[PDB]
Every structure is written in structure tokens, then in C-alpha cells.
Amino acid sequence: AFEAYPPEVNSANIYAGPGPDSMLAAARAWRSLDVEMTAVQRSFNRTLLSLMDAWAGPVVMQLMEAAKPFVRWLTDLCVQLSEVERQIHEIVRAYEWAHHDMVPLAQIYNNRAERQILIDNNALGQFTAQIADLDQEYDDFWDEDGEVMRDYRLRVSDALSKLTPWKAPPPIA
């Protein structure tokens, strides 16, 4: 219920923070992290494969085979790393829409200013329709802000649901 909060608060809250730059730096970081771990995976396969043959022996194979679970785990980690960046970008884009779609504070304040000015001069009932007009606009701002915030919650929640727990590696016997 961001629809519990009034437009003054929902709009102010979305315009408060420092923006997405922190999230975008983290995104780039997860990406460089996926890259290094790709290169790591390949050099581990290298150490097991390319730099092995020269020396043969049943023990060489016993180890080379016991490492199979871990190389497979490494591949699965690499896939999972490549998704983080994507989900961060979805989070940020959703935030951008929330920020862009919220009713600007000035419009909410101008609405309360004008309604009060009509009230001030409505001893004769001349402005009762226009006050009703400003009241409906305000209620509309409340519903709109509430809806923006609901759609932001939904998008961020979906994004996060794609971020699966980091699974532990198996041992190399």
C-alpha cells in the first residue's frame, strides 16, 4: 500500500535519493566479474587439459576426473554471473519510469494552493464545482502516485526473483 501514503510523500520519496549511478557502477562491476571468471574457467580447463598430457599416470587421471563436478559448477557460476547485470539494468529502468511517471511535487502543491484560494472566496457557493474539480485532481494524483509505485514494486520484485541463490562449490575430493 503505497496508496496509503499521500502524493506529497510518494512523489517526494521518489525524487529524494541520489539516482541509479550506484546501481550502474555495480552493474559494470558484475560484468567485469563475469569476464574474469570466464577467463578463470578457461585457465582451469587449461591447467587440467593442455598442461597435463606430458605426464601420464593413474593418479593424474584420478585427480583430473575428481575435478569434474567443480568444472561443471564453474560453468553454472558463469551463467549465473551473466544474469546479475541484466537484472540490475531492469531494476534501474523500472526506477527511471517510477521517477519519470510520478506526479511532480509542484503540481500537487499548486493544486492545494488553488483549492485553498477557492475555499477562501466561496462564502457564496460560486466555486463549489471548481473545488470539487481540484479535489478530484488531487485524489487522482494520489491514485496515480500509488499506481506508479505499485508498478515499480512489481517490476523490481520480478527482477529480483530471477536472482537465484549462489550455490556452493563441490570439493575436489
Binding site: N10, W30, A39, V40, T47, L51, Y95, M149, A159, A168
Partner: protein
């Protein structure tokens, strides 16, 4: 068989590179701030921070595995 000790050195280098890259991006991945003051922004930023931390732990366990494996090559030689 010198080749097993060679491998052990390579596996240790691979460990060094994993923890190096991990530690290199930790200050960004663990420092995610909420974009705004609302609850959605904050929950998103919090989740990401915890996710980055559980990843750092996962890699430390992988470093342990790598080192144990390299040790199995050295003392197992």
C-alpha cells in the same frame, strides 16, 4: 613427477586471480545505494548488497576448494 607440482602452482595462481577480481569489485557490488527514499528502491539496494556478499562467500569457498586441490597435487606427489 614435477608436472603435479607445476599444476599445483597453476591452481594457486587461478585462486589468486579469482579472489583478486572478487576483491576488486567488492567495493562497488557491496556499496549499492538505494536510488531514492522509497521502500522499493531501498529493498532493491539491500537485496543486491546481500547478493554480492553471498557471492563473495561462494568464491571464498571455491578458493578453499582450489587450494585443497593444489595441496592434493603437492603432498599427493
Amino acid at each position: 613427477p614435477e608436472a603435479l607440482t607445476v599444476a599445483a602452482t597453476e591452481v594457486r595462481r587461478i585462486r589468486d586471480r579469482a579472489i583478486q577480481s572478487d576483491a576488486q569489485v567488492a567495493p562497488m557490488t557491496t556499496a549499492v545505494r538505494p536510488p531514492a527514499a522509497d521502500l522499493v528502491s531501498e529493498k532493491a539496494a539491500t537485496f543486491l548488497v546481500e547478493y554480492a556478499r553471498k557471492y563473495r562467500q561462494t568464491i571464498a569457498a571455491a578458493a578453499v576448494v582450489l587450494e585443497e586441490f593444489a595441496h592434493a597435487l603437492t603432498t599427493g606427489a
